[PDB]
From a paper:
Seneca Valley virus (SVV) is an oncolytic picornavirus that selectively targets cancer cells by recognizing Tumor endothelial marker 8 (TEM8) as the host receptor. SVV has a typical picornavirus capsid with four capsid proteins; VP1, VP2, and VP3 are characterized by a single jelly roll fold, where eight beta-strands form a barrel-like structure that is distributed at the exterior of the virus, while VP4 is located on the interior of the capsid. We used cryo-electron microscopy to investigate SVV under acidic conditions and in complex with TEM8 at physiological pH, identifying multiple uncoating intermediates.
We used cryo-EM to image SVV particles after incubation at pH 5 and 37°C with purified TEM8 to explore the structural behavior of SVV. For both physiological and acidic conditions, the A-particles were resolved to 3.4 Å, while for the ER-particles, the resolutions were 6.4 and 4.3 Å, respectively. This expansion results in reduced capsid protein contacts compared to the F-particle. Inter-pentamer contacts are reduced by 34% and 22% under acidic and physiological conditions, respectively. For the A-particle[P], additional disordered regions without interpretable density include VP1 (G13, S20, and S28), VP2 (D12), and VP3 (E61-S66), while for the A-particle[C], these include VP3 (P60-D67). On the capsid exterior, the A-particle[P] had the following partially ordered regions: the VP1 HI loop (S229), VP1 BC loop (A65), VP1 Loop II (G97), and VP2 residues V59 and D67, while the A-particle[C] exhibited similar behavior showing partially ordered regions: VP1 HI loop (T230) and VP1 Loop II (P95-G97). For the A-particle[C], the disordered regions were on the VP1 N-terminus (E11-S28) and VP4 residues G63 to N66. Density corresponding to TEM8 was not visible on the SVV A- and ER-particles under acidic conditions, suggesting that at low pH, the virus potentially loses the affinity for the receptor or binds transiently. In the SVV A-particle, its genome is reorganized and lacks defined capsid-RNA interactions with the inner capsid surface, likely contributing to the flexibility of the VP1 N-terminus, which is consequently poorly resolved.
Numbering used by the authors:
A (entry chain B), E (entry chain B): 1 to 59, 68 to 238
B (entry chain D), G (entry chain D), H (entry chain D): 14 to 38, 63 to 72
C (entry chain A): 1 to 258
D (entry chain C): 12 to 279
F (entry chain A): 1 to 52
The structure:
């Protein structure tokens, strides 16, 4: 005999994200093998963990920064830590992160000196947690978390921004500067002036790379912005 | 696996639900090596 | 930590490498490629057939040719124009002047997350009405075929041939929806997100693949030719990749700086 | 220990300052199996094509801006004799078959010294169309002597100048604003690459396996891999030093296969 | 109690190709046995693998080709390899293939000499993969794949067209001459002129057959064309 | 390969018989007679009775 | 067998779902033989 | 537990029906103590 049943209030509804399959129409098809293609990607983090070049303003954009010769106490360059900020816009970390809502883990920064082999100097890198006003001098910078990097044989030096947050997970866009979106600043200080022998070009250049850390993680997908087509 | 919630019952046969490749006769590994 | 970036390979680190600290817990794995792409989305909007159709001719078509436009939709994330594959996406910023306007489409989300080079997956289709209380049907034929164009006379009532055929045709009740899944049926093993070859051996257009799609879809009203109405009708098409895979990294679009 | 020598056939190449060899995706990129989409007897490698072929690029000058680049389509370079490259036996055998598949090995050389400043990025972009003019026809050898270094602009950035299928006159021409073959300069480091600068090294070596949408591709049109050179930091040097450095490169095919023997190809 | 359930968005739909059965109406019927009929067909390949006669133009169609007496360097006859081409139209291989979309395997061709027993001669058969222009002389033909067939006691000679393709499976119709539809040409060359004794008819005739190979295969059915009724 | 077509029975061959080569893999079996014919199709159109 | 996807459950009995012939009391084989 | 009447069958998997807390590496008891 017929099994008696009563459908629920939710019937004939079409839900895009429903976690289930549907009815086939043209089954029994067999396809060519794909064993010959190497380098299968299993998770997009594999691509998020590859360094890429950032951008700045030369006033009209370049990835590097030119070390001046004048003497002043302001930071050489400083940008905030917010994945929606323009500097991270074109880097892979930012581009992928803009399609989600939350993140964890430690961000990573890398530099490389491309000046003459005969030069010598030292630089100071610091990371300042949030405050009423951002740092503006070496004395203030020394107190926060910082490290000293000196020009030598090896060319590059890596820096890690620790994950220090009042809550697990953080927003990936800053509609307003709540403590859950913005997380301080990063700034670079020229500790000592550069020394060059006679008859050498002045004003060397330095280069930046940005990538995800070891324990980086994303979550909660979201729809993407199509404005690029225009 | 995937965005599939069912874990107990499948009605249609595998060869009708999915496509298959005809035969011939954990942590993420890295891409790009140096030696 | 000291390192050399010129070597290409750089080992990812943690906070503890240079300072006192510890590593964080995993969390969740929402970045999985298979889990990311299994979500439906809009693809294109097409009209509904009310008689036998004439498939559009190839692109070198001159003026004065008679055919039906905007009735067929391709199943492919790549750009298309006039129901035929293309290479550059189009946009009409000045709807004025003579000439027929060319239909266009694209998969904005797929190309916003198109970080790889090759792709392969099954595909599930759905259709939905944009008019109140409409009756319609949907037809399909695989990649590398063509649509039969003629009709038959039953009791002095013309009946288009696309009613019958051994390739799927489906009907829906008043206000209903149509849903089903398709296999990967192209001759090529994988679908190229970006391509740089040529199909024909000469006089070809470089970078234009030949069979990068799943098939073709259209909609029609189940009534004879004698009931051609006076108002146009439209439907919407939804697609959803299933059991996807990727094969080789690439770069993402260029987000212009104001 | 920064000194290495690579040998193959009747040719050998060396270097006084090396940084390593980059393997693209696998442990041994040379290993490969014959294609499964043809049933005739194939033609494996013979000792007269296990070589390194050398060519010359255009010279680097200080007037070049940033992100300017030069391209070299690998299988097309032999066929077009770009930069004086000539394959001899390899070219002769490639002109007498229908199908071909193979990996590659490449190396580039420069001669900057400790008193110069600059950087160059070398990467292998797969599936690109930088070698075709906007009208859709391959660039002639005369165009390269005029456009010494390819400029960079929004058109290239957005792929708005890709090869075009004429749409006739029945329609009304639309506005083209985006294409799938765009180039994003800031992300070029995704592909296998090495960075060349004055202070560190003078050569870069990359090893790459085969890729394609089918087990094998037509001989006369496949363009899967492409070699790329781009400027990151513009050159500068003190007055009186050496000017206009030269550039050169060498290529080697690995584990080739051929199918579909016929007579010499001829366009028509 | 009633089992609560919610129907999906796909309900009341009629799908022609659905892989399932329906409700019976008049069951319990028993039918006569059919053990007495021999030669049951299990797969249409059994019929696809039977040779049949091709066609050509005598300018208005005949299956054979007449060997002339004049001397010239052009091929005696040449036709493309495309299942939609007219020559294969009426043969079983083509007729069946027109109802599908893809194919694999090796095609097979056969010839038979029906001239006087006293004649002697030799012929050259060649198969040219795709090129810019098709072959037009014996020197070019010799280089491609070819074989030599000589008139003797036995009358027929079989030839196999290898499956050499850039991809698995190939299209069975040529809307445009992409490399996935057209696959070169086949041509026949008269190596030496025929020798006949006095008082014998001139211009012997040769006959063609076409059939599927051992490893031939079809796939992906498609609807058929009803134009034949007119 | 030498053969006689007048006998009616001819044995199917492969590429390797007369040249160097190998046979291809099976693939799929869509030609099965039982599987081919199980598809609905239109047959006729008729009117509807309103009386005896 | 055939264009039938179900492989687990059958509701009606065989003699009601199909017709049967009342009793009385791999690779493809070739058609046509020569001896 | 809770205002849930079913006690025999669950269709979807637990990790899809409910949210879970990711790991890291009777009579009513009283509130407020005096010592």
């Amino acid at each position: 005999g017929p099994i008696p049943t009563a459908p629920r209030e939710n019937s004939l509804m079409f839900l895009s994200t429903l976690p289930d399959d549907t009815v086939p129409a043209y089954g029994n098809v067999r396809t060519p093998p794909v064993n010959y293609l190497p380098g299968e990607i299993t998770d997009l983090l594999q691509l998020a963990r590859i360094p890429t070049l950032m951008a700045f303003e030369r006033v009209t954009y370049v990835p590097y920064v030119a070390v001046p010769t004048q003497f002043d106490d302001r930071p050489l360059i400083s940008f905030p830590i917010t994945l929606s900020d323009p500097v991270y816009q074109n880097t892979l970390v930012g581009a992928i992160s803009s399609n989600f809502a939350n993140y964890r883990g430690c961000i990573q920064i890398t530099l490389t000196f491309c000046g003459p082999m005969m030069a010598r100097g030292k630089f100071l890198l610091s990371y300042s947690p949030p405050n009423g006003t951002q740092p503006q001098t070496l004395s203030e910078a020394m107190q926060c978390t910082y490290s000293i990097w000196d020009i030598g044989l090896n060319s590059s030096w890596t820096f890690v921004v620790p994950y220090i947050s009042p809550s697990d997970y953080r927003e990936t866009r800053a509609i307003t500067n709540s403590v859950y979106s913005a997380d301080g600043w990063f700034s670079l200080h020229k500790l000592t002036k550069i020394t060059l022998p006679p008859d050498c070009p002045q004003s060397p250049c330095i280069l930046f790379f940005a990538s995800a850390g070891e324990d980086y993680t994303l979550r909660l997908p979201v729809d993407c912005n199509p404005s690029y087509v225009f | 696996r995937g965005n599939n919630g069912n874990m107990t019952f499948n009605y249609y046969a595998n060869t009708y639900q999915n496509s298959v490749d005809f035969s011939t006769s954990g942590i993420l590994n890295p891409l790009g090596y140096l030696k | 930590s000291t390192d050399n970036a010129e070597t290409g390979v750089i080992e990812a680190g943690n906070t503890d490498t240079d300072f006192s600290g510890e590593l964080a817990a995993p969390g969740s794995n929402h970045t999985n490629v298979k889990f990311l792409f299994d979500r439906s989305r809009l693809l294109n909007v097409i009209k509904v057939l009310e008689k036998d159709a004439v498939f559009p001719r190839p692109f070198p078509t001159q003026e004065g040719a008679q055919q039906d436009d905007g009735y067929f939709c391709l199943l492919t994330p790549r750009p298309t124009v006039a129901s035929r594959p293309a290479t550059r996406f189009g946009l009409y910023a000045n709807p004025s002047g003579s000439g027929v306007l060319a239909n266009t489409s694209l998969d904005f989300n797929f190309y916003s997350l198109a970080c790889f080079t090759y792709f392969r997956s099954d595909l599930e289709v759905t259709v939905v009405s944009l008019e109140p209380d409409l009756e319609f049907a949907v037809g399909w034929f695989p990649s590398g075929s063509e649509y039969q164009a003629s009709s038959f006379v039953y009791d002095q009532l013309h009946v288009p041939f696309h009613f019958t055929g051994r390739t799927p045709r489906a009907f829906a009740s008043k206000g209903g929806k149509v849903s089903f899944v398709l296999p990967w049926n192209s001759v090529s093993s994988v679908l190229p997100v970006r391509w740089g070859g040529a199909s024909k051996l000469s006089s070809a257009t470089r970078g234009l693949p030949a069979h990068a799609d799943w098939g073709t879809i259209y909609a029609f009203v189940p009534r004879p030719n004698e009931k051609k109405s006076t108002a146009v009708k439209h439907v919407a098409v939804y697609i959803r990749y299933k059991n996807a895979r990727a094969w080789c990294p690439s770069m993402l679009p260029f987000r212009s700086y104001k | 220990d920064r000194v290495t020598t690579q040998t193959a056939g009747n040719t050998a190449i060396n270097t006084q300052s090396s940084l390593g060899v980059l393997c693209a995706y696998v442990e041994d990129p040379t290993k490969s199996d014959p294609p499964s989409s043809s049933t005739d007897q194939p033609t494996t490698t013979f000792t007269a094509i296990d070589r390194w072929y050398t060519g010359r690029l255009n010279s680097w000058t200080k007037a070049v801006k940033t992100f300017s680049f030069q391209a070299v389509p690998l299988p097309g370079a032999f066929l077009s004799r770009q930069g004086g490259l000539n394959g001899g036996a390899f070219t002769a055998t490639l002109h007498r078959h229908f199908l071909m598949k193979c990996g590659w090995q490449v190396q580039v050389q420069c001669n900057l010294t400790q008193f110069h400043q600059g950087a160059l990025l070398v990467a292998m972009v797969p599936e690109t169309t930088l070698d075709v003019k906007p009208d859709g026809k391959a660039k002639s050898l005369q165009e390269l002597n005029e456009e010494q270094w390819v400029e960079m602009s929004d058109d290239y950035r957005t792929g708005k100048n890709m090869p075009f299928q004429s749409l006739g006159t029945y329609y009304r021409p639309p506005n083209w604003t985006w294409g799938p073959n765009f180039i994003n300069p800031y992300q070029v480091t995704v592909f296998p690459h090495q960075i060349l600068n004055a202070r560190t090294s003078t050569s870069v070596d990359i090893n790459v396996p085969y890729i394609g949408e089918t087990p094998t591709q037509s001989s006369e049109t496949q363009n899967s891999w492409t070699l790329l050179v781009m400027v990151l930091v513009p050159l500068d040097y003190k007055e009186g030093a050496t000017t206009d450095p030269e550039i050169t490169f060498s290529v080697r095919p690995t584990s080739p296969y051929f199918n579909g023997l016929r007579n010499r190809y001829t366009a028509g």
